Amino acid sequence: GMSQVQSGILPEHCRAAIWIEANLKGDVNALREASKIFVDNVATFQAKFPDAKLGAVVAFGNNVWRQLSGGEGADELKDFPVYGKGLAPSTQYDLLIHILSARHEVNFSVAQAALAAFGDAIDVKEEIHGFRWVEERDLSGFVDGTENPAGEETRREVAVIKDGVDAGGSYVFVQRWEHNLKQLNRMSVPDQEMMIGRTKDANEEIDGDERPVTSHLSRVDLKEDGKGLKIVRQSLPYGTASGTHGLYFCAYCARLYNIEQQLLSMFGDTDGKRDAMLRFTKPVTGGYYFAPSLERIQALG
């Protein structure tokens, strides 16, 4: 008489992921059977590829989740708003599929299964293939993940709703960034470090009173009476070397509040200052989704 978290929220150090963002084309009913088939497929792939350490998440946007849940729970869920009067654009869709594992080839089979399950009920808007880069660095050359919640216990505390109707569920935020590495390269390494808030090569934190308030760490390392507003990031680099490339940002949190506070900070809504990373990269998509517990996907009918 308890809830099980979907398999894709908690895994750490996965080398590869696939994110699919889509709109509902017909009657929302279509999503009930599809979602059950999809989590069943995931169980099948986990049985066939035990060494892939595969996980997946199916999450819903505000409008369709409100219909599927009958308005019960997910109290913080809302369409992704524009932040910074447009600095952060909004591309709220109806369905998010997040697949992550040690094997891209398995992720790809799982993605085809997802598409077969939902079929023509969805309009695919974005399909991004994430890959861990050398030393777990973002394409900018800075390590991404150092202060991310570590271990199943702490990641559950941060990401998974603890009781009531939503127990086992989580709020998800996705935002695709397009890096301009030419612009980044014009910056001296010390200027880059002051932009991030950590040294580039050795990845040492720069003290808060040494770095500008516009540094990334000064914008997102937030505390409320000493209590950090933590989130579980699953972001990964993506793209081609000669084409579009950047970071596919993805975060999970028991409370949408922690994510929103960091976005208001980054995009200038809190103190009128904005994140220094906007000097070389920009966000081009944005959405908020609710990841129900596995058993709630099983009580969809």
Ligand code: HEM
């Ligand atoms: C281009 C997009 C982004 C890049 C390249 C980026 C890069 C980084 C880097 C290099 C770090 C330091 C290492 C680490 O602790 O993980 C970091 C930390 C962090 N980022 Fe970002 N980030 C991006 C977007 C975002 C967004 C949109 C959010 C939240 C809405 C976010 C939240 C965080 C948090 C919470 C930390 C940990 C800070 C701490 O407690 O020290 N990041 N990011």
Ligand SMILES: [Mg+2]
């Ligand atoms: Mg800190």
